[PDB]
């Protein structure tokens, strides 16, 4: 809704006595529901998302080191110790170095040396938990009335659903109401998945894969980075010093490792790039407006000429300049002579309530050459169409 | 030199009439050259390096995008154009998007859409060319004379070589001649020095040129193949999501884990190679062979201690002696004065008074006695060697 602009479009035709109609809604794709003597219903999946998901883990992929301290005792008497050894935010290594005369050591052999460095994570990846019962989804619904595209945003009724929400009613003024009985299909394995977000970008990843990452990781409460050694390298000691270096930024390797996973985008709410919604649509309470109106006989004008939609249909915008509340006769014939409709009207029973009103018509013409005829008499509009 | 402090130590003993002695020097490793009736020569490889190598390539491994511009025409109305399409520093894509009445074009079909973005490299890797004719190497040479460790840097002669033989004169001890050749692991014509921030490597040219990353030259600053770090997601209506790919520092470094390392002076030093040397020992003379024997009292400034080389070192002070030589032996008994030990510091010496002299001896296995001096003034130290 509106399904004319959305290129991936399916038509579902209801049977005359049908009360319910099955329809599955996919992302970037919409469905047009038709039923005899009833207005056409455009349905579409807008978003499937999660609100306020809980953090379970953080995984650092870029770390910086500060406050690098070194203690370098001599052989025999002396275990080396640094105060930074008993602090939580320090990556430390305890080793022994070859020392003797020349390094200020009265004996030749191994001297204890400890190197500690402040571990502070520059950039980390957030791992949120996904709950099925916290999933909400949004569906656009809009009836096929003669409305301008610039009025679509006024007509579209947007519906919000929860994980276990029930059938939802949508009433269109002067057209009755429809009922949507929808069910959400995740495409995710909650008991085995995380939301992994780096800076701006997010994914649906395997929990096992995330926990098996060889990178430092944190928790939801205490802020002490665990397994810091993954991003901190201690080179072999020379005399009384140790080269302590932080490893490279792991953004790239991670992202390349994430190329095939289901995508997620967080915006001012976590949108899911997948999934779909199974819906049962009640059409019986949907009524056609102005079936008893008189016929428009006044001069009409194509504000917008019949044009191809790519859906195998044609659309046009007709202005009714003088004609009062009246209905518009639109048919697609094989000739100017026979008044036999070979085309199918998607915008069922067109109407012009007020004057100078612009009304949008969509028709499914037959294959080949045809005539789009709108109105009667000398006032009627005819437009040549070819559809191989 | 001095090879005592360097734990990885080899001994090379020359034959009596030998004029030349072969020796191979590896990184962080030294050799002690001995020869009968001649002073011991400590040789070591300090550095093998390159001076001012020429930059040849750059390879961006982190890029940032700014100035994201987009131009979007409707179907059947023209190709979309941006001013930034013609600038050198912009990554651009031209595509077509699904359009119609839904986005405000009066026809349904493909509308031209172009997206450009300012490409600026945050962090890049420099690829220098390695010219073997710019390779220099440094060798420490130092004789085993009776000195203290704190005087070693004063005694040590440091030598520089490029891609002939160099003479090293020790005052009062003659001179040695080093005919050295440097062997490094480089296919100069098939290698780069690859430097990122602080760390550098010796990399293979093919690998460097085959990297799926944007690359530049030493001259003009126009980044080529910018698409390697820039992704244009499929167009929706009138926009395109333009993303810069992730920092490639980690993947690059992990791909480089096994390669030969390179560093800088705080002059690109190589973490490898070795030097093959021919050492001339004939012109080396021993000092103070005719000095009298120290008969006055001596004292251990530093007691005999294990070096880890199977040898022992000690520091002896001569306070009340004149220019004199010190008799050092290692016997298996205090009565028998028969030396079973090998003197590394050949013919110890005391030029001035209160002089402290370092003795290094290679004692025999088992129980032994280190004897310094004669008479009642002599120092004895029981030593055990497994």
């Amino acid at each position: 809704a509106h399904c004319i602009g959305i290129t991936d479009r399916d038509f579902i035709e209801g049977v005359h006595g049908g009360t319910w109609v099955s329809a599955t809604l996919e992302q970037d794709k919409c469905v047009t529901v038709m039923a005899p003597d009833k207005p056409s219903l455009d349905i579409s999946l807008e978003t499937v998302a999660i609100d306020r998901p809980a953090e379970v883990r953080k995984v650092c992929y870029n770390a910086v080191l500060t406050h690098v301290k070194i203690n370098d005792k001599c052989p025999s008497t002396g275990e080396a110790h640094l105060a930074e050894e008993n602090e939580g935010d320090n990556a430390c290594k305890r080793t022994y170095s070859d020392r003797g005369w020349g390094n200020g050591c009265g004996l030749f052999g191994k001297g204890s040396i400890v190197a500690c460095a402040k571990f502070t994570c520059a950039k980390s990846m957030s791992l949120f938990e996904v709950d099925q019962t916290k999933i909400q989804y949004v569906i656009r619904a809009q009836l096929h009335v003669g409305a301008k595209q610039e009025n679509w945003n006024t007509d579209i009724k947007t519906l919000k659903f929860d994980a276990l929400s029930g059938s939802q009613e949508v009433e269109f003024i002067g057209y009755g109401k429809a009922t949507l009985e929808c069910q959400v299909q995740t495409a995710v394995d909650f008991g085995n998945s995380y939301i992994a977000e780096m800076e701006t970008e997010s994914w649906i990843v395997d929990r096992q894969w995330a926990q098996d990452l060889t990178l430092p990781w944190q928790s939801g409460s205490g802020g002490v980075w665990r397994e810091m050694h993954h991003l901190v390298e201690f080179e072999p000691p020379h005399a009384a010093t140790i080269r302590v270096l932080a490893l490279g930024n792991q953004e790239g390797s991670l992202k390349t490792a994430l190329t095939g996973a289901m995508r997620v985008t967080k915006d001012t709410l976590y949108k899911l790039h997948g999934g779909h919604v199974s819906c049962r649509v009640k059409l019986s309470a949907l009524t056609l407006k102005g079936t008893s109106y008189k016929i428009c006989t006044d001069k009409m004008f194509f504000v917008k000429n019949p044009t191809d939609t790519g859906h195998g249909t044609v659309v046009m915008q007709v202005k009714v300049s003088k004609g009062a509340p009246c209905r518009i006769p639109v048919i697609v014939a094989d000739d100017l002579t026979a008044a036999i409709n070979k085309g199918i009207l998607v915008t069922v029973n067109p109407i012009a309530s007020t004057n100078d009103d612009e009304v949008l018509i969509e028709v499914n013409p037959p294959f080949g050459d045809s005539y789009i005829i709108v109105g009667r008499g000398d006032s009627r509009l005819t437009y040549q169409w070819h559809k191989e | 030199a001095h090879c005592i402090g360097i734990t990885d130590r080899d001994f090379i003993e020359g034959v009596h009439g030998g004029t030349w002695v072969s020796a191979t020097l590896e990184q962080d490793k030294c050799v002690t050259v001995m020869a009968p009736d001649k002073p011991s020569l400590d040789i070591s490889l300090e550095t093998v390096a390159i001076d001012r190598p020429a930059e040849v390539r750059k390879v961006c491994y982190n890029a940032v995008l700014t100035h994201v511009k987009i131009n979007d025409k409707c179907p059947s109305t023209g190709e979309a154009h941006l001013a930034e399409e013609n600038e050198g520093d912009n990554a651009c894509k031209r595509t077509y998007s699904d359009r119609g009445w839904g986005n405000g074009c009066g026809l349904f079909g493909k509308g031209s859409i172009v997206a450009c973005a300012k490409f600026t490299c945050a962090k890049s890797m420099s690829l220098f060319e390695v010219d073997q004719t710019k390779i220099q190497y440094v060798i420490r040479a130092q004789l085993h004379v009776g000195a203290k460790q704190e005087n070693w840097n004063t005694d040590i002669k440091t030598l520089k070589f490029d891609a002939g033989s160099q003479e090293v004169e020790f005052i009062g001890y003659g001179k040695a001649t080093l005919e050295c050749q440097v062997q490094t692991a480089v296919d100069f014509g098939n290698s780069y020095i690859a430097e990122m921030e602080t760390e550098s490597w010796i990399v293979d040219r093919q690998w460097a040129q085959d990297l799926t990353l944007p690359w530049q030259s030493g001259s003009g600053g126009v980044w080529r193949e910018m698409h390697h770090l820039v992704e244009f997601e499929p167009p929706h209506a009138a926009t395109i999501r333009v993303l810069a790919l992730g920092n490639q520092e980690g993947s690059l470094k992990t791909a480089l884990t096994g390669a030969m390392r390179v560093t800088k002076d705080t002059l690109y030093k190589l973490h490898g190679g070795h030097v093959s040397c021919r050492v001339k020992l004939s012109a080396l003379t021993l000092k103070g062979t005719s000095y009298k024997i120290c008969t006055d009292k001596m004292f251990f400034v530093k007691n005999p201690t294990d070096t880890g080389h199977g040898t022992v070192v000690m520091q002896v002070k001569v306070s009340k002696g004149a220019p004199c030589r010190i008799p050092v032996i290692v016997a298996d008994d205090l009565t028998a004065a028969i030396n079973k030990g090998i003197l590394v510091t050949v013919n110890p010496i005391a030029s001035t008074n209160d002089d402290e002299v370092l003795i290094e001896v290679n004692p025999p296995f088992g129980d032994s006695y280190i004897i310094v001096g004669r008479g009642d003034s002599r120092l004895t130290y029981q030593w055990h060697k497994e």
Partner: antibody, heavy 120, light 107 residues
């Protein structure tokens, strides 16, 4: 836990020399710059000077002509010797470690101090 | 020898206050500046190094800023511990120079 203790003659008559010694425990003296700093009663701190294991040393210009700082590496202790004393030299003398890491490029200035010793 | 000045000479304040001490070098010293806290009869303790970096484990209420000539030490919320004399010191190049000190006492 790197600790420094300075010791030596407490009461010094004028015109003599000052023999102070700082003893280093918990760490060797191969690294860092070992320094002396003094503080007269009721005034501010005056940086006297330093010496390293390398042999490189440096003294305060107002004191350079008199000050001699030496290093005994074996016992890991270093000594201050100030000549041509005066009433101005009456101060609390601290020995301190200037931490210098030339491998990872970290410098914390004087990070470890001794109790300080009062010379008159 | 580079000359260091401090301002103010003395500051009286109460517990819970925000205080800011200033330190000036005769010439640019980059960021190589240290802050020391000295209590009567005791040795100076290292608080800040490299202008802004805190020594572990100095309370996070302590902070430093500045580079070149101008420097400031800041205590966001004063405590009974903090009442002592604060000295600044340049260690960009020898000879090193301490400041005259800023005395901080209770009102």
């Amino acid at each position: 836990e790197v600790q420094l203790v300075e010791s030596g003659p407490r009461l010094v008559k004028p015109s003599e020399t000052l023999s102070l010694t700082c003893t280093v425990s918990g760490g060797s003296t191969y690294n860092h710059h070992w320094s002396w700093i003094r503080q007269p009663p009721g005034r501010g701190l005056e940086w006297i000077g330093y010496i390293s294991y390398s042999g490189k040393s440096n003294y305060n210009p107002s004191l350079k002509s008199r000050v001699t700082i030496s290093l005994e590496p074996s016992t890991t202790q270093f000594s201050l010797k100030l000549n041509s004393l005066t009433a101005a030299d009456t101060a609390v003398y601290y020995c301190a470690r200037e931490y210098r890491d030339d491998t990872n490029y970290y410098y914390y200035s004087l990070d470890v101090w001794g109790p300080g010793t009062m010379v008159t | 020898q580079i000359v260091m000045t401090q301002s103010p000479s003395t500051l009286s304040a109460s517990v819970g206050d925000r205080v800011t001490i200033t330190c000036r070098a005769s010439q640019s010293i980059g960021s190589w500046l240290a802050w020391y806290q000295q209590k009567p009869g005791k040795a100076p303790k290292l608080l800040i190094y490299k202008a802004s970096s805190l020594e572990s484990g100095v309370p996070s209420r302590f902070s430093g800023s500045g580079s070149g000539t101008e420097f400031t030490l800041t205590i966001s919320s004063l405590q009974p511990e903090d009442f002592a004399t604060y000295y600044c010191q340049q260690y960009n190049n020898y000879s090193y120079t301490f400041g005259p000190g800023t005395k901080l006492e209770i009102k």
